[model samples]
Target: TQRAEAVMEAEYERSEALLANMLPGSIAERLKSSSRSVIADKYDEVSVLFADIVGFTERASTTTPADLVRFLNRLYGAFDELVDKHGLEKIKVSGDSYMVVSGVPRARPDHAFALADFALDMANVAAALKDPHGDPVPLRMGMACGPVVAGVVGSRRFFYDVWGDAVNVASRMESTDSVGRIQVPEAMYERLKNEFVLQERGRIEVKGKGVMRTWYLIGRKADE
Candidate 1:
């Protein structure tokens, strides 16, 4: 009887396996363990991108829980496809925010350029999404090129994440940026300006880094 019952209970776990394939191995492990934490490692040249949904929280507050979750899932689903479409990795998610990266897990010299292009694409996609009430819910994105340490924190329930000034500055770029726009730091702009049109955003205060120069990504440079 037990043998027959066991056979019936041996169900396929395709969705679980597919989910594991989507995230980094470390993250998958943390999800299973529930008490594990991963720490960040220093990478010489990492390209970080941050994108935040405009008016997301306000919209959430006004939406029914079921509808809100569905809306967010659709938005993030589109975002993930865009990131992967450009040969980048989705790093992690924080509420209504998304973070992605290139040049790590396998480094590439063109990481910065790739990320800049990706940010622009995100802007284009976010501009296309309309809320249930027929309002546009766009996104703001930011990019920065520098070093960082990626890892997971908190044992109760771990998450894969990154740290360092580069990560911080990247967040600032998004938080200070306008809706439906892409902001990039100077370091990233220098490497990608030749391939992407940029408008200087002047000096801005970025928490740890005071008065940093920023740029707006318009389009790919003529040469590209």
Candidate 2:
């Protein structure tokens, strides 16, 4: 009986670790305790960030597959560390794109500030990484803040995801942003203006949403 109990305990720990990787630690705990098969929560406010490598497709075409994989692994590994440091949830990474969010599964008053700092850190880290030829690889980033709906998807695969206009706008911001810069919508600008130094990029046309004012996040305030 003692040996059997120990085996069960080990299995439980492994299962917990797998679940925690798929979802946030707090969300994983809730799912383990809940009897329901489906779990969902609505967050009134959260900051979503999306970033992608600049012209990676063209770069990949010229590079060998092994070199490409090594490059991406090193680059993304750096980004993963930043996400963990900022206490943000990494939504997922699709090809050259990376997504992350703050203030979901757990709400925090400083969600915008946390995400801004994370974005800046990511930019700085990416700028320092060099290709085999020693040339810098740039990243384009976008951020927005608003309500979001978070929940689990699929019974077999069991994926945790978030959805809403906030997510969509954040993607647009990334897709429309300039390389080597972090672009943000007016909403995000308002939340982070006082905490960080920002430069107005003026109004620009956004796909599906017409023209709107945008800003570039430079860095943190000198005193702060």
Candidate 3:
């Protein structure tokens, strides 16, 4: 009957809609249209951000499995809000490490600025979730700006990823720092300098990349 046909269509599209929501709409369309072919997108300049929650393992050890997940959901679920608000693409989440890119799929001139605000905003969200002891969870955030080739990989189970010099540097910024700070390369500082306040970290050893100049994005420039 026609009713059966309608029900079948609804059932199939429901799952398809789930996949579409997880990925950028543009990428989702490509995969839907051509599942067999490879997809690669390049952006000459986009801002890449990587953030990982510090002090999570120590907290995880003490809490019940359900309790740990509640904390995880609150933070990342909160992150999802900002991701949408800031108009950035959520690339992937590797454990507590969250990756994002801006000025891609739909390039924007203010990619750097857009992402900078997201990090600062993200830190505040980090503050909102305090441990049982009333201590805020720390977020080690890093960002870099440059070109990248975003493509899909994985055999039967496909995954989307971004790879470029910028991606590595962004990851480097997160790893090189130990404290609750937003670590960024000189280029990021330059891009956001006029509108943001940052304290120079001077030249630091960035492992595999030699000495590099970095900065801690303290806050917005409104006060200054």
Candidate 4:
């Protein structure tokens, strides 16, 4: 058998795998059909969120690699479902860091409210699970609002991502946040303040930004 068809068979499987994988929808189509050199679009209004697992490195080191991976898969699996339910795109999951931006490629007027609900559910799920060592995992979250340029980059772990000062500050906010707390800067507060329960966190130093006012997202209005 010369087997030229074997290689031809592989070509069709390639197209099959493309759609089976995930994307933010329209952008994926553009990425495939367009002859553009780069993918970048500016969204005038969007909400950015970054979340990280608390003490995950320590927890990982103390546990078996198999158990550690299992823990992550289980937790992030639930997170993915939440993302779909809230109409958010999970940009990436590099290590323990999780990034989500609402109103990207598409405009979502209530992005803040949608992300807030997702944040609350994220924490609730994190707290609801017990690690192999029998302890509830803690999560830290951050949120910001502004325009962001969404684009595609990377070689091996290829995917869509967003970038802007809002993205930067959101990362800073999450890194500085305490366990089980969803923190936001003053700007994000303005968007969510009227509808969500937020408490003053006082002024805190931010990277590349001077002391800034922040708040803690407690819960939703009248859902106490």
TM-score of each: 0.85, 0.85, 0.89, 0.87
Which residue runs does candidate 4 get wrong by more than 4 Å?
1-15, 18-36, 154-157
lDDT of each: 0.79, 0.85, 0.85, 0.85
lDDT of 2 by residue, 93-209 (tens): 878888899998789999999999999989888887786556788888999989998987655555678887888888988988988889998888988888799999989998877
* Clashing residue pairs found in predicted model 4: none
Better of 1 and 4 by lDDT: 4
User: What is the C-alpha local distance difference test score of candidate 2?
Assistant: 0.85
**Which residue pairs clash within candidate 3?**
none
Model 1 Cα lDDT, one tens digit per residue, 1-224: 98877765554456667666665876566567755344556787888888887877677566777787788788888888888789888877778888998877778999888888788777777777787666888888888878888766765455566777778888999999887778887887788876778899888888778888888889887762
Ten-residue stretch with the least lDDT total in model 1:
30-39
- Write model 3 residue lDDT over 1-224, tens digit each, in one string: 98999999999999888887676677777877856777887889988999997877788566776776777777788788899999998887777789989977788988988999999899887887786445678888889999999978766566778888889999999988757899999988989998899999989998778999999988889863
Better of 1 and 4 by TM-score: 4
Off by over 4 Å in 3: 32-37, 131-135
Name model 1 segments beyond 4 Å from true. 1-22, 26-39, 60-62
Give the lowest summed-lDDT range of ten residues in model 4. Answer: 19-28
lDDT of 4 by residue, 1-224 (tens): 45988888899888768754656566577666844566678898888889988888788667988888887888788899999988888888878889988887679789889988999988888888888798888888999988799987753444778999889889988988988899999999988988898999989999898898989999999954
Cα displacement (angstroms), candidate 3, residue 5, comes to 3.4
